[PDB]
């Protein structure tokens, strides 16, 4: 019904599951 | 629905090996007499009844 | 029978038999090739023609050679008998089965109020002064244009504007490109207040023109410069609608920061905004972090508690995302951590309550499936009647819809309310939407209080006009509930109720299926002449997953009326009791005995009335059982309590032993022999089908051998003298 | 296929556990949950098992004793030995090595008396 | 109506499905249940203690339930309840105490 | 079975749920063999380069990809992970289903045509596909799937349906095209079998037959035998 | 002793049990007295016709003790009586020629249930469905017949 849903097909082995605090996103700008 | 409504629970269990000791006396185990509330719902040996004696 | 009338030959146009349903590929599409297509006819065997002609010749002899002797010796009662539709049959998304249709209500004008207490999400064009001259020129193009394009965006899910509208209107295409040249160089503070204007006020969730991609770079470079809540605004700005416009990494960043810095969000409203935005999370682990925090921060006002129920209502963690193996009923334990944390505040000061903050409690509780919060409702009972006249058109429906299903779809109210709320409905009648009107018509039949004056002026024409069409699929059901509760039998009205479902392009949802299957067996008992086949294709998908036994684990907990008499049936006395037995996947009988087709249904505080009569459910059900020859002992739980304790056990025995015998005879008397009759006629319909037709015809005359069989007609004789007459 | 001709006999090394018993008395609390079921299984192996490898006067019982501290497995051997093992904490494996610690000695006691408490070689092959 | 809502917490919070042996002892969980009942039975005007004693003998004869512990159909002494409700009702009761009041010495 | 017989007799009536359910699935499938499900599938991927050689990828467990194009269209060759490729098979719908490939903002429709595996080593060599474009002809494989019918009289008894072809090659000119074909053979018989032109007469307007692939419309698919007893009586006599 | 050494299936006439040498091949090496054995058999089966062949089982034990048990006659033999044939089809499924009607099946199932120890738990649909599958293997069908058959005494090996 013209829905935007769509099955992404990709291996989740690559996707990293880690935490990044305010610091990690603070330092990377500089 | 039976298991919740029972009051005087009498847990039983078998110590049968095979019916040869019973067949070769022309005997066997009845369940028509006292068709019970439960037979082997989770534990496949347990039986529950109201009758404090059960032959 | 049929097969003898069969054509000796079929054309190419007749091999494929007709069908009740077209497929989705017979649609009219852009490109087409019927025009140049040629017609093919299946050849006839060259030797078969030598057989077709001979039988045509021997038949032609006997016509004349017998006529020569003469000279010597002499419906669809839906659409009328002609005209009927053909439902398109397609494969279906899950979405159609779990979608509350948005037609029949001016949704967004209605829906924006109920959130409006959340200030940070309120979109503001003038907050963005540089582009406000541009953005507003776009919205003129939206409404002023033909059709109702922006108005179809959320409403007609079959319609899109990110592809149909924006990608083709060249005025707008200039305007969105004026933006991109600006987006990169703005301050990081104005971005989220812009995104709200895109997603809601303009409906641009996609990245067609490449706008969000520039927003990400201008956003991700200065994540650390933001406060906490100004990130939450991005979450709700993007993820609140169908495409999560942003990327994964830009949201994982937001998702990773926030649950570290929960120690610094100051207020409880700031949690309200938070939870309502982060409601679509798949990870369970972090909802607990939120609720574990809320259990720490006490609330000292009343608008706060309202601001949590209305949010916690919609923002539950569904059970399908949960694991398959889990602690028992652990979804409930997530609730009462809040409800035990709120019960004081909402109870101490419920008199302090006003019309805008009034609606959201009835909704917050109905969505939460409880029966405890009566005290606030009593303080609300006193509230409406005072202000009965000064109410808005909006605050009437939600009351009528709220009190109808107050305590777990058992209502809560008094005749003072609804009799007063007629007038409040008669004031704003032209202002309600079709959804609101039906929901009134539910609440009265829910209590059997419809005025005969009130059905005539407003409901009767409204239904006559809009029942056949111009009525969303979800509003038929509140009508489907009530009419059977009204015990109506006018056939001309039930037609439109069926014609819509058959004509409607959309399939039936499981959310709204329980009436559609009740109303089936309602009409079938009255009228056996219909054919509900089209009315089953629309119901095809829902019935597959449908099961009534799913209700068992809940009723086994929250119905003491069920067990206590159940204890008596099993322990003390002796019958082949079963318990909850699903009546053709539509009901579950409270207690039953079989094969005798016996029923012991019960009235209770759910199913009684102040008058003591049964609720109009509990008379509906006991029709359908009786219609299908299923004996009944309508028990009234009060009267059974009144019996003296020694006489309570035999009193059931005296009834059940009698109701058995009435059925025990009826099985001997009618059904048991009558099944042989259908059996032995079923056996013919097979032997009719095993026929070699060419061998059986063998000319124009039919000479079947006949088998004699012992059959005891001594019981039944209407069918003997019915067959012996037609047969000779 | 092909017929075996080498006969490997394993009857003399057969050492079952409940063989030197004269009696047994199961004890049950309905308040245990780990010490009930362990005793359930033992009572089967005392009767569900084979009588050849038991004494002739072997009688096992079961009683529900609410008064006990814990569910128990009392036992009595041939040459005088008697013990009790509570079951609210133990396993079925920790029990068997105790039974071996008796059954290994009763052989050292009865063989000295001259008794052949061993089995023929032809009882169980491989 | 604020009592029904409060009550359903305390039965939940004291759902302890451990098997039991009916003894003098009781869990700390069960005591939170009992203590909530007494807090509600103490703070009631005497017009209400009158009423509660009338409720019970409307609820005990109904006895929807079998158990050797709780209320029970097979409980023997139910039939007398229809006759006598309060000992203050029996005027003979009023004789006993004044009669006994003089028998202390 | 799992409950004693003595209890089943009390609950013999319960088993209507068993049989009333199997109505629903097997009828649903039997009518849904034909239709493509309306569900979008996507495959993130990367472009080709002359740098990424096969054996380099194959330690990284990626895979090559190949697309053949149609009239006026250029070919496209891509790189992707193996586990994407097998997951694309693992649908019901693999013979015809439309799969997309997202390199960047671009998407390329395709179909499955086939895969090659190194037989002695048994790892994935390449995954080959066929382009699809809306406004132009496109090769697809429409399998034939025959329903059962207890309405004809010869089909019921001692006769045998013979499916000589598993599918049909066609050319489609529009977005949504039918997954397969379903037939109700009641009107058929020993005298007339079904022929491809009986199908060509009944299709949507966007579909045509690929005559380059088939031999002749007079070719026949479904054939029906005679009776067995009429043979068997003659066989013995 | 009470331990079961072996089990044997047999076939016997009711009242003409007799130390036939064609049964000592099985019961000979077990040391069982054929004479003392057959006595206890004929004693029980005095309420049964003597023409009929039954079957019996014997849990022969380690001390050469015995405990005989009686079962109904062979289910196939009972149908050859009704069918009035002695020998049945080589093939099955392909060659189907014989016919009984249900009204005797309902009567010969009672034979099995009244005697056989295995079916004491069972219903009649259960038993009747057991032989139909045995009938599929034999060339037999179940079709309504008004007529009765006439007597026949099909063989048995005894």
From TrEMBL, chain A:
Belongs to the universal ribosomal protein uL22 family. This is Ribosomal protein L22/L17e. It comes from Tetrahymena thermophila (strain SB210).
From TrEMBL, chain B:
Keywords: Membrane, Mitochondrion, Transmembrane, Transmembrane helix. It comes from the Eukaryota. The keyword Membrane applies. This is Ymf74. It comes from Tetrahymena thermophila.
TrEMBL record, chain C:
This is Uncharacterized protein.
UniProtKB/TrEMBL annotation, chain G:
GO terms for cellular component: mitochondrial large ribosomal subunit. It comes from the Eukaryota. Keywords: Methylation, Ribonucleoprotein, Ribosomal protein, RNA-binding, rRNA-binding. Residues 71-142 form the Large ribosomal subunit protein uL11 C-terminal domain. PANTHER family: 60S RIBOSOMAL PROTEIN L12, LARGE RIBOSOMAL SUBUNIT PROTEIN UL11M. Residues 8-66 form the Large ribosomal subunit protein uL11 N-terminal domain. GO terms for biological process: translation. This is Ribosomal protein L11, amine-terminal domain protein. The lineage of its organism: Eukaryota, Sar, Alveolata, Ciliophora, Intramacronucleata. One of its GO terms (molecular function) is structural constituent of ribosome. It holds the Pfam family Ribosomal_L11_N. Belongs to the universal ribosomal protein uL11 family. The keyword DNA damage does not apply. SMART domains: RL11. InterPro entries: Ribosomal_uL11, Ribosomal_uL11_C, Ribosomal_uL11_C_sf, Ribosomal_uL11_N, Ribosomal_uL11_N_sf.
């Amino acid at each position: 019904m013209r829905s935007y849903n769509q099955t992404i097909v990709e291996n989740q082995k690559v996707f990293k599951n880690t935490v990044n605090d305010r610091e990690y996103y603070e330092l990377k700008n500089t | 629905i039976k298991s919740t409504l029972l009051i005087n629970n009498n847990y039983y269990f078998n110590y049968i090996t095979n019916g040869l000791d019973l067949k070769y006396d022309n005997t066997f185990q009845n369940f028509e007499l006292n068709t019970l509330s439960i037979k082997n719902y989770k534990n496949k040996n347990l039986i529950i009844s109201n009758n404090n004696q059960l032959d | 029978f049929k097969g003898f009338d069969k054509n000796r030959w079929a054309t190419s146009a007749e091999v494929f038999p007709e069908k009740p349903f077209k497929y989705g590929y017979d649609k009219q599409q852009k490109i087409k090739t019927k025009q140049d297509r040629q017609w093919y006819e299946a050849p006839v065997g060259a030797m078969t023609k030598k057989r077709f002609q001979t039988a045509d010749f021997r038949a032609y002899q006997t016509e004349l050679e017998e006529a020569a002797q003469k000279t010597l010796e002499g419906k669809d009662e839906i659409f009328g008998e002609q005209g009927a539709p053909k439902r398109y049959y397609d494969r279906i998304l899950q979405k159609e089965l779990y979608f509350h249709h948005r037609n029949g209500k001016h949704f967004f004008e209605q829906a924006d109020r109920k959130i409006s207490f959340l200030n940070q999400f309120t979109p503001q064009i003038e907050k963005v002064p540089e582009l406000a001259e541009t953005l507003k020129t776009i919205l003129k193009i939206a409404t002023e244009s033909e059709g109702s394009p922006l108005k179809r965006a959320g409403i007609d899910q079959e319609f899109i504007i990110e592809d149909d509208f924006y990608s083709e209107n060249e005025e707008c295409k200039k305007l969105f490109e004026e933006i991109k040249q600006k987006v990169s160089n703005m301050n990081y503070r104005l971005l989220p207040d812009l995104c709200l204007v895109l997603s809601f006020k303009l409906r641009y969730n996609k990245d067609v023109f490449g706008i969000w991609e520039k927003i990400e770079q201008n956003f991700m470079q200065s994540i650390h410069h933001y406060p906490v809540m100004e990130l939450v605004k991005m979450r709700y700005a993007s993820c609140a609608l169908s495409p999560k416009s942003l990327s994964r990494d830009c949201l994982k960043a937001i998702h990773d920061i926030v649950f570290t810095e929960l120690h610094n969000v100051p207020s409880v409203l700031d949690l309200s905004h938070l939870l309502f935005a982060f409601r679509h999370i798949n990870s369970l682990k972090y909802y607990n972090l939120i609720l574990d925090e809320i259990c720490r921060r006490p609330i000292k006002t009343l608008q706060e508690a309202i601001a949590l129920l209305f949010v916690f209502s919609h923002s539950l963690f569904p059970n399908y995302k949960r694991k398959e193996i889990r602690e028992k009923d652990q979804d409930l334990k997530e609730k009462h951590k809040i409800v035990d944390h709120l019960a004081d505040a909402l109870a101490n000061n419920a008199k302090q309550i006003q019309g805008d903050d009034f609606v959201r409690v009835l909704i917050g509780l109905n969505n939460l499936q409880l029966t405890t919060f009566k005290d606030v409702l009593t303080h609300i009972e006193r509230y409406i009647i005072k202000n009965i006249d000064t109410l808005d058109a909006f605050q009437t429906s939600n009351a009528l819809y709220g009190f109808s299903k107050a305590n777990n779809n058992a209502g809560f109210g008094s005749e003072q309310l609804y009799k007063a709320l007629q007038k409040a409905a008669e004031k704003h009648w032209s202002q309600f939407s079709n959804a609101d009107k039906a929901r009134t018509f539910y609440a009265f039949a829910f209590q059997d209080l419809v005025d005969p004056v009130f059905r005539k002026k407003f409901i009767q024409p409204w239904l006559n006009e809009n029942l056949e069409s111009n009525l969303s699929h979800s509003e038929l059901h509140y009508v489907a509930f009530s009419l059977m509760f009204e015990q109506n039998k006018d056939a001309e009205i039930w037609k439109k109720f069926v014609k819509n479902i058959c004509k409607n392009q959309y399939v039936v949802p499981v959310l709204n299926y329980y009436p559609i299957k009740l109303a089936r067996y309602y009409m079938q008992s009255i009228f056996p002449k219909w054919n509900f086949d089209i009315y089953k294709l629309a119901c095809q998908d829902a019935e597959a997953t449908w099961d009534a036994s799913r209700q068992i684990d809940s009723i086994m907990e929250n119905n003491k009326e069920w067990k206590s008499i159940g204890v008596l049936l099993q322990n003390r006395l002796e019958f082949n009791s079963i318990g909850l037995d699903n009546f053709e996947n539509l009901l579950l009988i409270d207690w039953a005995i079989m094969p005798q087709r016996v029923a012991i249904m019960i009235q209770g505080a759910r199913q009684t009335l102040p008058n003591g009569k049964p609720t109009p459910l509990h008379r509906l059900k006991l029709q359908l059982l009786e219609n299908h020859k299923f004996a009944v002992f309508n028990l009234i739980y009060k009267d059974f309590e009144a019996i003296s304790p020694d006489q309570k056990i035999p009193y059931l025995k005296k009834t059940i032993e009698e109701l058995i015998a009435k059925q025990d005879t009826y099985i001997k008397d009618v059904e048991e022999p009558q099944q042989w009759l259908s059996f032995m006629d079923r056996m013919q319909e097979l032997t009719y089908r095993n026929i070699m037709i060419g061998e059986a015809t063998k000319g124009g005359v039919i000479d079947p051998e006949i088998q004699e069989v012992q059959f005891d007609w001594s019981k039944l004789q209407k069918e003997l003298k019915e067959r012996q007459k037609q047969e000779e | 296929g092909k017929k075996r001709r080498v006969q490997v006999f394993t009857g003399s090394m057969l050492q079952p556990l409940y063989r030197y018993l004269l009696s047994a008395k199961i004890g049950v609390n309905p308040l245990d949950l780990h010490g009930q079921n362990i005793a359930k299984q033992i009572f089967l192996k005392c009767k569900q098992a084979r009588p050849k490898y038991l004494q002739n006067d072997f009688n096992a019982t079961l009683v529900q004793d609410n008064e006990a501290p814990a569910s128990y497995f009392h036992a009595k051997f041939v040459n005088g030995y008697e013990q009790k093992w509570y079951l609210h904490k133990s396993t079925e494996e920790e029990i068997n090595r105790n039974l071996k610690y008796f059954n290994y000695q009763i052989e050292m006691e009865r063989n000295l008396q001259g008794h052949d408490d061993e089995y023929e070689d032809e009882e169980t092959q491989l | 109506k604020x009592f029904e809502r409060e009550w359903q917490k305390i039965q939940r919070e004291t759902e302890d499905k451990q098997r039991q042996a009916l003894d003098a002892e009781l869990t700390p969980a069960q005591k939170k249940r009992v203590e909530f009942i007494a807090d509600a039975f103490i703070e009631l005007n005497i017009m209400e203690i009158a009423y509660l004693n009338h409720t019970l003998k409307e609820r005990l004869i109904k006895t929807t339930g079998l158990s050797p512990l709780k209320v029970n159909i097979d409980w023997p002494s139910l039939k007398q309840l229809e006759n006598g409700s309060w000992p203050p009702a029996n005027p003979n009761w009023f004789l006993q105490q004044e009669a006994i009041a003089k028998l202390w010495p | 079975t799992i409950v004693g017989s003595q209890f089943d007799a009390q609950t013999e009536h319960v088993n209507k749920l068993a049989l009333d359910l199997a109505n629903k699935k097997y009828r649903k499938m039997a009518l849904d063999q034909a239709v493509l499900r309306k569900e979008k599938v996507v495959v993130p991927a990367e472009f080709r380069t002359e740098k990424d050689s096969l054996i380099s990828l194959k330690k990284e467990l990626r895979s090559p990809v190949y697309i053949k194009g149609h009239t006026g269209i250029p070919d496209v060759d891509l790189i992707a992970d193996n586990r994407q490729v097998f997951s694309i098979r693992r649908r019901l719908q693999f013979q015809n289903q439309s799969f997309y490939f997202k390199v960047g903002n671009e998407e390329f429709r395709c179909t499955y045509d086939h895969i090659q595996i190194h037989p002695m080593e048994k790892w994935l060599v390449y995954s080959k596909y066929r382009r699809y474009v809306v406004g132009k002809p496109n090769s697809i494989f429409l399998p034939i799937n025959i329903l059962p019918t207890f309405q004809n009289n010869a089909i019921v008894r001692g006769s045998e349906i013979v499916q000589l072809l598993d599918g049909i090659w066609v050319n489609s000119y529009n977005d949504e095209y039918p997954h397969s074909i379903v037939i109700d053979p009641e009107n058929l018989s020993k005298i007339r079998p079904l022929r491809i032109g009986d199908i060509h007469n009944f299709l949507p307007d966007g579909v045509e037959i690929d005559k380059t692939k088939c031999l002749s419309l007079h070719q026949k698919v479904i054939k029906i035998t005679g009776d067995k007893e009429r043979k068997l009586d003659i066989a013995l006599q | 002793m009470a331990e079961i050494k072996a089990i044997i299936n047999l076939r016997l006439l009711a009242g003409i049990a007799k130390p036939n040498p064609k049964m000592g091949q099985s019961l000979g090496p077990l040391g069982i007295n054929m004479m003392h054995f057959c006595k206890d058999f004929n004693a029980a089966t005095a309420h049964i016709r003597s023409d009929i062949p039954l079957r019996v089982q014997v849990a022969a034990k380690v001390d050469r003790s015995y405990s005989y048990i009686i079962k109904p006659p062979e289910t196939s033999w009972l149908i050859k009586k009704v069918i009035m044939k002695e020998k049945l089809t080589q093939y099955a499924g392909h060659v189907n020629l014989d016919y009984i009607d249900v009204r005797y099946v309902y009567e010969i199932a009672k034979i099995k249930k009244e005697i056989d120890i295995d079916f004491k738990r069972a219903t009649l649909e259960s038993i009747c469905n057991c032989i139909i599958g045995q009938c599929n293997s034999m060339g037999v069908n179940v079709s309504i017949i008004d007529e009765k058959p006439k007597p026949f005494n099909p063989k048995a090996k005894v």
